[PDB]
């Protein structure tokens, strides 16, 4: 599970993100679309060009969900329950794609927060995102 130190690192990192959450979520999405083009079909209405408005708006929704999760490290299944239904039952998202987006978010954080993205913090953030993804894929059944 997430250790005390993990929780400390996740809190510290998300404090450093602060108001830039939506920017970083948008960039994570752009990186995913570029590296892994199969993912684009989940968002058929999107202009996925650099800096597009719908990407920025959706990046903000993802960022908001992750910020709430970071304040809920001890009850993630409860906090992410509604989103788990949406992604499994409605969107039917392939579980591989959560790993892809998680990797792209880590790339994004490393690119933006070099002083803060230490190996220890990276390890904690990888666990955080994997824990979130686990809940989001928990309900195929």
């Amino acid at each position: 599970v997430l250790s005390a130190d993990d929780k400390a690192n996740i809190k510290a990192a998300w404090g450093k993100i602060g108001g830039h959450g939506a920017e970083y979520g948008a960039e994570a999405l752009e990186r995913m679309f570029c590296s892994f083009p199969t993912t684009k079909t989940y968002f058929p209405h999107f202009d996925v060009s650099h800096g597009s408005a719908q990407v920025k708006a959706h990046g903000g929704k993802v960022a908001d969900a992750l910020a709430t999760a970071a304040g809920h490290l001890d009850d993630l299944p409860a906090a992410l329950s509604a989103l788990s239904d949406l992604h499994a039952h409605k969107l039917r998202v392939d579980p591989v794609n959560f790993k892809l987006l998680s990797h792209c978010l880590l790339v994004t954080l490393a690119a933006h927060l070099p002083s803060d993205f230490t190996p220890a913090v990276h390890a904690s953030l990888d666990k955080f995102l994997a824990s979130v993804s686990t809940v989001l894929t928990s309900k195929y059944r």
Partner: protein, 146 residues
């Protein structure tokens, strides 16, 4: 593998903007910290008991350099990664017994470390080119597995 000439230039251009020894030491060190089961292969390396110990470990840093020097040579042979990594594929399979999934994980660390060092210069397009490279290196390292 199949990168266009322009994609190759994007990759090799950015490679000349980093310090390979740092990329290698940090990618290997992050591999060991983020995915601790990988430490099973490095018992001879001494203290790997925390991220601080891992990043302060001289043997990790030295090994990181050998790994990255082999990566750098791969960058000069992108049209034949299979041939380039054939001997190392045999080493990792026959002598070391490393599951090939871990090649993908180390490739991912190289990608993250490149972003960490290059910042905004590691664009979504640059990342895509590098993902193709590390995917190809992983495929090549897995090729002689039996």
């Amino acid at each position: 593998v199949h990168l266009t000439d322009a994609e190759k230039a994007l990759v090799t251009g950015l490679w000349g903007k980093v310090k390979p020894e740092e990329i290698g030491g940090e990618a290997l060190g992050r591999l060991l910290a983020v995915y601790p089961w990988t430490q099973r292969f490095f018992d001879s390396f001494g203290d790997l008991s925390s991220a601080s110990a891992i990043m302060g470990n001289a043997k990790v840093k030295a090994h990181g350099k050998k790994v990255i020097d082999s990566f750098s040579e791969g960058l000069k042979h992108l049209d034949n990664l299979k041939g380039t990594f054939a001997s190392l594929s045999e080493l990792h399979c026959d002598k070391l017994h490393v599951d090939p999934e871990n090649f993908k994980l180390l490739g991912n660390m190289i990608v993250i470390v490149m972003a960490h060092h290059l910042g905004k210069d590691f664009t979504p397009a640059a990342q895509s080119a590098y993902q193709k490279v590390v995917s190809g290196v992983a495929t090549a390292l897995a090729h002689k597995y039996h």
